[PDB]
From a paper:
Porphyromonas gingivalis, a black-pigmented Gram-negative rod-type bacterium, is a keystone pathogen linked to the onset and progression of periodontitis. In many bacteria, the enzymes phosphotransacetylase (Pta, EC 2.3.1.8) and acetate kinase (Ack, EC 2.7.2.1) form a key pathway for production of ATP from excess acetyl coenzyme A (acetyl-CoA). Pta produces acetyl phosphate (AcP) from acetyl-CoA, and AcP is subsequently converted to acetate by Ack, with the concomitant production of ATP through substrate-level phosphorylation. In the current study, recombinant Pta (PgPta) and Ack (PgAck) from P. gingivalis ATCC 33277, encoded by pta (PGN_1179) and ack (PGN_1178), respectively, were prepared and enzymatically characterized.
The structure of PgPta in complex with acetyl-CoA was determined at 2.0 Å resolution. The asymmetric unit of the P21212 cell contains one dimer. Domain II is responsible for dimerization. Structural comparison of the subunits of PgPta in complex with acetyl-CoA with those of MtPta showed that both subunits of PgPta are in the open conformation, with a root mean square deviation (rmsd) of 0.89 Å (314 Cα atoms) and 0.90 Å (318 Cα atoms) for subunits A and B, respectively. Structural analysis revealed an acetyl-CoA molecule bound to each subunit, with seven direct hydrogen bonds or electrostatic interactions between the bound acetyl-CoA and subunit B. The adenine base is recognized by two hydrogen bonds with the main-chain amide and carbonyl groups of Val150. The 3´-phosphate interacts with the side chains of Arg89 and Lys92 in subunit B. Arg135 forms an electrostatic interaction with the β-phosphate. The second amide nitrogen is hydrogen-bonded to the carbonyl group of Ala175. Contrary to predictions, acetyl-CoA molecules were bound only to site 2 in both subunits of PgPta, even though crystal packing of PgPta does not appear to interfere with binding of acetyl-CoA to site 1. Since interference of the binding of acetyl-CoA to site 1 of PgPta has not been observed in solution, such contradictory findings might be due to crystallization artifacts.
Author numbering:
A (entry chain B): -2 to 334
B (entry chain A): -3 to 335
Amino acid sequence: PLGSDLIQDVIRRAQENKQRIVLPEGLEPRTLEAADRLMADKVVNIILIGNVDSVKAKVAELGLKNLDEAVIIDPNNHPKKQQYTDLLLQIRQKKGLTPEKAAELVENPLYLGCLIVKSGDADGLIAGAQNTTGDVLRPALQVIKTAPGMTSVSGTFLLFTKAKEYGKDGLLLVADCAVIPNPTADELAQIAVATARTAKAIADIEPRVAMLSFSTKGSAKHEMTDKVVEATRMAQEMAPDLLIDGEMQADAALVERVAALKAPGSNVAGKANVLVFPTLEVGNIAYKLVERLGHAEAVGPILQGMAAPVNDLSRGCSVEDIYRMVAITANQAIAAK
Amino acid sequence: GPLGSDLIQDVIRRAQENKQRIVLPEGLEPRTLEAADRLMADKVVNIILIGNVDSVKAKVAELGLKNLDEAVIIDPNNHPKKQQYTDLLLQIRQKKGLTPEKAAELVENPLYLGCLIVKSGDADGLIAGAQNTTGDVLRPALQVIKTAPGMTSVSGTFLLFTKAKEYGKDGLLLVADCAVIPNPTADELAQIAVATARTAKAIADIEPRVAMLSFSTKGSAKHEMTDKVVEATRMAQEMAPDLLIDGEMQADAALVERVAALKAPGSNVAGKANVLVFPTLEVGNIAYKLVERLGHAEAVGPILQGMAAPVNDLSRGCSVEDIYRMVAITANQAIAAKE
Ligand SMILES: CC(=O)SCCNC(=O)CCNC(=O)[C@H](O)C(C)(C)COP(=O)(O)OP(=O)(O)OC[C@H]1O[C@@H](n2cnc3c(N)ncnc32)[C@H](O)[C@@H]1OP(=O)(O)O
Ligand SMILES: CC(=O)SCCNC(=O)CCNC(=O)[C@H](O)C(C)(C)COP(=O)(O)OP(=O)(O)OC[C@H]1O[C@@H](n2cnc3c(N)ncnc32)[C@H](O)[C@@H]1OP(=O)(O)O
């Protein structure tokens, strides 16, 4: 119930600017059920990957009545197979892919799905109900690649807290909580800019980005603090339109009275709604403790920094969670154009 | 507030039942004196104040405090044990190049004198930092009192009283190291784990189950940074076979039975943790503050651990009630150290 209002807004913005979303796991029942609801509610235009007769059989078997307009693409046989094979070789031959092996890969639903998006025949992709994170992300990084002026992808969570005096009515975006173990200064700056733009695209927030540390504005100098200082500088340079400040402690980021004392004349401190963590140790631990010990609702991870949005579901994701992640993906696609 | 109030009441009561001698080096600081007055009224501890006797008595009369006539006041410039404490200080710090000339200056510094009083067995613990920096409190404590048997590192723990009563002990977890060591080695992290578990036992009447946290659970995400937590876990288990310590694990595996069953089957900690050990100060400093603010948890501390006799450091903005509370904690640490 925390963040059902925001998710309702995300669904509506998807509905108002309809994106084409590829679901490579076209025989997975949770995926198909979610696809049926998304098409009933006209949230997105669905593309399912699988043998056409098998997918249609499974749709009829699950009693789904809203998928007649879904496009179904058999990776073994479809009119753009050679085109996508040629595109794949163009992207990946140099990197050791033979035409022999390109012909195999193009028949793998995850690779095919990424090539559909990359070609401009779709706007985004969701998988991972029946694949590992790595098998989803790898083709996405190889084929779709990163957005202009970015070399790294990262994972953000929407963190809907019960503390409505922080963030946007209790919501903060937090990153990187899933992908990069130990970002360099450069990576951390890219995380900062990416998360701010996700904040704008998904949460309709005016981002104020806190680059977190155990130091605030030189209070605790150390090797680990220097990286966050450099990251802050480089983020500010990469994006002069965005409010980004650091290094600061979490209390300076969130609490006006502490901001006044330790970070005076920051335009972020005391008002942060985006938190950038210096390592995955920090991010992975911190968001889970806020989720459990704070009773916060965490939505994600949401992958950011891709030229076109790919998201990765968990293997235990509900129908409603798949629906939700597709709606988010559509919003990321709108932002990417 | 109300989350911590039952346990803090127990801590004060256990102090009252075995009265310890606590040194307050900042003997003219008004918040400290007010707290000392309440502690003496309530018979929580025997207070020792450091300062010129006439000045301290003048300040006591000036603040209208009626319960400090039995407080011991030691003037650092002139008191019966000055040469004894000076000789002790030279004996501890001669190797390290302290001259008798410089010993004679240091022994007159209230923070050094306070530590020598404890070290000599003339007190049981010390509290300062209302008017001194953390570093000026810690330095004499580490030089004079030093670390407990079998420990080389001192760390800081918080009592974290959360609103999630289904975790920890009715919502309480101890977390460390959240204040002192920026980047513990594997050995330091193991010592943090054993120290915090024993603090948990002594202060919070917790049966410690210690989770060594990482972004990996039992080899799920192997990496350079996870290796330190794996090694720390092994070394902690070896140092303390009487304690339940496991790792590496994620915070969800530490706290959630359903996740523990999947990611850490046959841990005797996972899903039941009540002590969390963080791999770095970045993690600890950020994580406890986010839980405090975003979770509405109450955090008490930092509490210093690993000292041969307890020294605690107050913040410069600490209330009278917070000083009272920290003195009660320190007395409980002394009771644990003597046992
Ligand atoms: C390694 C650990 O288990 S600890 C980290 C804990 N976190 C996670 O596991 C979550 C996901 N982490 C990952 O590493 C992802 O699963 C993966 C898919 C990016 C790793 O991919 P790998 O199987 O290592 O393949 P490899 O790194 O050889 O190739 C993946 C491609 O993406 C690139 N890449 C890897 N990480 C990133 C990133 N964060 N951003 C952008 N590109 C990346 C690689 O350079 C490579 O590109 P290339 O083939 O064009 O050179
Ligand atoms: C503040 C920064 O720049 S780093 C990042 C943030 N850190 C913090 O917020 C924590 C605050 N901590 C501190 O002030 C320091 O860590 C201190 C006080 C513990 C150490 O600083 P100093 O008192 O100047 O110690 P210094 O480095 O001068 O001397 C080291 C001595 O203390 C000892 N020591 C230092 N830290 C510790 C510790 N955590 N545990 C045990 N012993 C210690 C050394 O072994 C050495 O002993 P010796 O006198 O017998 O040689």
